[PDB]
Amino acid sequence: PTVSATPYDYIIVGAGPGGIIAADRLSEAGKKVLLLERGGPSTKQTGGTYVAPWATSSGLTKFDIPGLFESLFTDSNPFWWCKDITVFAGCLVGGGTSVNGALYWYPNDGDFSSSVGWPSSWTNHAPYTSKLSSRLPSTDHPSTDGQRYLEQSFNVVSQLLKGQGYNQATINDNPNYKDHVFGYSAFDFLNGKRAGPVATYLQTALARPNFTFKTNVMVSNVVRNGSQILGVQTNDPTLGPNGFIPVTPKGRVILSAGAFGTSRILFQSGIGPTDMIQTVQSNPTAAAALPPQNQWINLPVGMNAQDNPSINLVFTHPSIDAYENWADVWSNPRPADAAQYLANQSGVFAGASPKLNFWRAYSGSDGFTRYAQGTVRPGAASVNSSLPYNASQIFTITVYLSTGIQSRGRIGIDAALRGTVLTPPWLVNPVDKTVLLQALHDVVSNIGSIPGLTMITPDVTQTLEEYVDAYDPATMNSNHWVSSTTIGSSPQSAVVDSNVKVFGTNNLFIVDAGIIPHLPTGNPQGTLMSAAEQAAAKILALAGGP
Amino acid sequence: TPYDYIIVGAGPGGIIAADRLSEAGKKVLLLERGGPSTKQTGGTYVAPWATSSGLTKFDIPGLFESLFTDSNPFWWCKDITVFAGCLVGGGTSVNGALYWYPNDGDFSSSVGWPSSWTNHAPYTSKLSSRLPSTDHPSTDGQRYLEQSFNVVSQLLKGQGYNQATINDNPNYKDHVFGYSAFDFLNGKRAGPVATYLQTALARPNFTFKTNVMVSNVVRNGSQILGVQTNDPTLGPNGFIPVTPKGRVILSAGAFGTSRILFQSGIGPTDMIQTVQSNPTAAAALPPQNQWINLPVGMNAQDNPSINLVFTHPSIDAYENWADVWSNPRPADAAQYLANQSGVFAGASPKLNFWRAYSGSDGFTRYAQGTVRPGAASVNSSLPYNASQIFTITVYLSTGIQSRGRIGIDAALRGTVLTPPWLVNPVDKTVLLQALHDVVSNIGSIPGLTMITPDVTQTLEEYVDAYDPATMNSNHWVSSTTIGSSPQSAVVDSNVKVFGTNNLFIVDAGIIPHLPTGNPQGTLMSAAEQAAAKILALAGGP
């Protein structure tokens, strides 16, 4: 074939938070970096054009406006979800950060403890968390006017929690203070708009001549001769011969394609468990791209997957404003709220749906301390009540467990090469379940002390125990996948080393949620971003590089 | 604006209904949730090699297989867990286009059709003339990439089969094989989009709107008032009314129609309550005392498909179809670009065959084979030459007794609640006999090897280890079956939903049993008949 490709010092696969941060920090260091993304534009500044009818004149998209978050789940044509993964994953510029609730918690020291699986060389996360907080300062008042909006559910739940001995704090002012703490939801927004890596890290990268970003490019596999990765195989023939893009002689490939995406690339590269590589091999086309069998690397790719077990509790209280259950924000918003947002990016639309977050630690019979997290939002996705209720008064408390859980599951691919959950990770460990039930019970323990507060799902005829046992396991998915390519010290139990290099390779690295060895206390994006900063630093400091 | 007919879904059923009702002079609106498909509909998703022609992925028959290997398949309905086409033409824009005129047995009262439907001929004739069958779709009249036809023809002759032009005599299928037939025109995909839709679009009394999703019909008890949509420019808050005697026709496919019905308070209580569990959807439901209990999503039927994979030295696996979009064989691309002849003028199927089997329960069942070069999945413990692979897909059709169930999950996605494949044990016994028969004389054909299942795995073991979900043939029928009573059916002989004054269904759901072949030919004939019945029913607009 005749296309001559530009070789790169770093080819980074996937423009999610891991990939973007890596791309920024590596290009900042002067390295010749290529960032590849399978999906298309997201927010306005990336070229995105999917704009609410009411937002036309601003050009701000469904991804730009925080208050449109819940409308990501009610659109008739959600182009933003990865079409070849059976659970939610964002496939567009920014990855999950363009379609998430944007809850943003700086990691606590325990999140990077060696006790949870991080190498000793990672525990001192503070310098990297500091770099993050400078790029993306937390805000719990994202509205540009500094006021907070649609806080009725915060007001009810704060009173519930105060009776349980909780104390209010600005969460991110001291990330280590988590047990019996609640506070306003924090986001990585800027100027009342979604921000995250797309608005910060990507923008500083894009300004550099030594950085190149290509969207609508899918990577099927890395190309390698044993331990030496030569480059990546793409579906774009203008970037190289039949879609192959090489690295420079000392160059490196960084996979940042997300839990399901990265795992698939690895399998399709002959890296992972034998049953997964055989799955690939069962597809004659993909089989032709596999290395010979004697070069397969057996690593626990997709194993030890962890995601929080989420349980929704639904309530009513007369003071709550369920905001039309978010059903009207795209097509027919409350005019004054919409106008406010267009005028100066203040008001309801400057925040996503969450309003209050809380945490509590629990002792376990197995000796592990577990944390529960609550997230309160107006509205509800599902209600199962035998009694009438006023839909305008509904709100949800979603409870999950995080730190200390012992449940592990498994992700991988099916025969159609779709990313899928092979072994559900939720409540595999019985003590996880026991503690979850205790936490749910604690949340509602003093419900009678709040006048007008009613739990409508589970309703009065169903116990919490019955509720959890009847709950669909797949709906416990919190979209917080970690550990599928975990960092560690041995290829028997981990996929990447202390420098996020894949075992068995000279020059293949992973920077995405899969490396995180255990779920952190809060929603994970803040932890991953800190880890991405740390990973980039490690990769840069790792000798033998370009 | 009020319409005499609002038709929901621009699949074959909806398009044919729209054409025939507008031909009769009625004010017809056809709604489609998806966007353009083929060039003529405004579609622009064109392979690099095909650019100068403007012929899209959907227009070019030979790009069929690439509909399953694209990195961004926007054409599949995003809220249904199995394949469904959500674009102009529905499944007919994304299917293999195998096209069989229905036989008399497909319309028999013994399979569930009312007496008044059995004389399908006047309607099948209408269809065969708008969409004439071709088993040589290339514009030069020649056939291409036929090595798998040659191999399997010899296998089948040794089993007593005879060749025929299949559609010349639809009533005769047992022990017959022939070249695959399609409803193509001028070397391109055709179907209703190229025929029925085009005559409808020429009429001033027909309106077609894409990118419009209907969530539910709006009704006051038995009287449907109109449809609720997500487009605020077509009526107040998205509501579009019918005229006083006006009618709504649901043609949204097996999963789409069933969902609409659930969201309209029509269906099994469990499903309507699933809708009610979503507070937003709950607000759009009629009060519970107005719900209509009908077996919507029940009686679902789809063929149980089993793929058998083979090699033979004469076969050209055509790079397993992997390169047709991105880097096709230059001569083949050039041939198609020039005059729409060659390999690209046909989809992947080359040979089709059928055989009748008597079952121990007294029903005769038919098995169908479809042969194509290449294979989607191979599970061989022995080495094989990938350039030599081909598939025989075997399924059962006529006479099968298995029924499953489709519906919605809590997220309001269309889903398979009860897999329909091999629920009935006699269906399984017969499928295994059919599989054994197909490979009975493999040893008499020099060079022919079966590689999946390989020599280490018996057919019995293969079937038992098979993922049920992969048996899906994408031929869903019967989920809103025609019948005589609401105790066992959704619509009556005029395809009117029981308990309603003016709600009808014209889509695969109404078909009471799988027909002998791939169903599109049957469905399209049935849509012709349905339109006539609707027009003939007094009290309409």
Ligand SMILES: Cc1cc2c(nc3c(=O)[nH]c(=O)nc-3n2C[C@H](O)[C@H](O)[C@H](O)COP(=O)(O)OP(=O)(O)OC[C@H]2O[C@@H](n3cnc4c(N)ncnc43)[C@H](O)[C@@H]2O)c(O)c1C
């Ligand atoms: C999906 C989802 C996630 C949420 C959600 N909510 C929160 C939240 O509020 N706060 C939080 O901390 N985390 C939240 N999470 C989790 C958080 O967003 C993820 O943990 C985080 O985004 C993971 O980052 P990664 O870098 O591991 O991976 P991504 O999936 O974000 O991005 C990968 C990208 O690579 C791409 N890609 C994938 N495969 C590729 C391939 N083969 N070739 C090229 N590019 C590829 C993608 O298209 C994509 O853009 C949520 O509501 C949703 C619906």
Ligand SMILES: Cc1cc2c(nc3c(=O)[nH]c(=O)nc-3n2C[C@H](O)[C@H](O)[C@H](O)COP(=O)(O)OP(=O)(O)OC[C@H]2O[C@@H](n3cnc4c(N)ncnc43)[C@H](O)[C@@H]2O)c(O)c1C
């Ligand atoms: C999906 C598919 C089907 C195939 C396939 N192969 C064959 C074959 O080769 N030959 C054959 O006879 N049938 C074959 N079938 C089956 C055949 O295509 C189907 O049985 C047939 O298309 C069903 O026709 P219906 O009229 O029942 O339904 P469709 O799904 O075609 O169309 C429904 C339409 O309504 C739309 N719609 C759905 N919900 C809607 C809503 N709520 N609002 C507005 N529009 C809606 C859709 O977007 C869509 O365009 C195949 O390879 C695939 C991948």
Ligand SMILES: *[C@@H]1O[C@H](CO)[C@@H](O)[C@H](O)[C@H]1NC(C)=O
């Ligand atoms: C529903 O609750 C809201 C707010 O508490 C109240 O204003 C409204 O009147 C209630 N509706 C009914 C039917 O009482």
Ligand SMILES: *[C@@H]1O[C@H](CO)[C@@H](O)[C@H](O)[C@H]1NC(C)=O
């Ligand atoms: C729905 O609520 C009823 C009682 O109101 C309960 O019996 C049933 O189990 C609930 N469903 C689930 C899935 O929890």
Ligand SMILES: *[C@@H]1O[C@H](CO)[C@@H](O)[C@H](O)[C@H]1NC(C)=O
């Ligand atoms: C429903 O229609 C019936 C019969 O025409 C009529 O009596 C009733 O007032 C209607 N109800 C509503 C709210 O439209």
Ligand SMILES: *[C@@H]1O[C@H](CO)[C@@H](O)[C@H](O)[C@H]1NC(C)=O
């Ligand atoms: C694979 O089979 C093809 C077609 O029969 C043949 O031409 C080719 O040489 C084969 N590859 C080898 C050498 O095994």
Ligand SMILES: *[C@@H]1O[C@H](CO)[C@@H](O)[C@H](O)[C@H]1NC(C)=O
């Ligand atoms: C794959 O083939 C092997 C024999 O090579 C067999 O033992 C195994 O069961 C097959 N897998 C399936 C799912 O049929």
Ligand SMILES: *[C@H]1O[C@H](CO)[C@@H](O)[C@H](O)[C@@H]1O
């Ligand atoms: C490789 O380069 C040649 C020109 O040398 C082209 O003809 C070919 O299509 C490809 O770009």
Ligand SMILES: *[C@H]1O[C@H](CO)[C@@H](O)[C@H](O)[C@@H]1O
């Ligand atoms: C790859 O990139 C180099 C410079 O980065 C170009 O010179 C070349 O044409 C190709 O775009």
Ligand SMILES: *[C@H]1O[C@H](CO)[C@@H](O)[C@H](O)[C@@H]1O
């Ligand atoms: C072909 O040209 C490419 C860029 O156009 C170079 O990167 C390569 O080294 C070769 O000269």
Ligand SMILES: *[C@H]1O[C@H](CO)[C@@H](O)[C@H](O)[C@@H]1O
């Ligand atoms: C509905 O359609 C009518 C005519 O069919 C228009 O007059 C009206 O503006 C609306 O488009």
Ligand SMILES: [Hg+2]
């Ligand atoms: Hg789009």
Ligand SMILES: [Hg+2]
């Ligand atoms: Hg801590």
Ligand SMILES: [Hg+2]
């Ligand atoms: Hg260096």
Ligand SMILES: [Hg+2]
């Ligand atoms: Hg053109």
Ligand SMILES: [Hg+2]
């Ligand atoms: Hg597109």
